[PDB]
Amino acid sequence: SMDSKDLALCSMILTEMETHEDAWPFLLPVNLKLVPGYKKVIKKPMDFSTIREKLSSGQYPNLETFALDVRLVFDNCETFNEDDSDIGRAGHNMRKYFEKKWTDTFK
């Protein structure tokens, strides 16, 4: 499992994402009952609160598995929403922010 430093780094980056102005579509799970089509086409839904619960409960054995789930949030967003939609653009902006933060942390 991840040591204390790695857990702290994941938590720090996740908090920076949760507080970003463009995080609003990604803070909680998509409600599959209220958003038709989502369950059908998005096979692995993911959101920041779920990532937080996974991190806290020891479900990420390493940094790479954490980053995969963060990226999954944005990959799902790209599929379900038009690139030019408010959510689509929020997702692209958040991906850019994450990749910069990730690169600045581990370089």
Binding site: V35, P36, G37, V41, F80, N81, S85, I87
Partner: peptide, 7 residues
């Protein structure tokens, strides 16, 4: 109805 999105 057909198509994706949250509009």
């Amino acid at each position: 109805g057909k198509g994706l999105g949250k509009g």
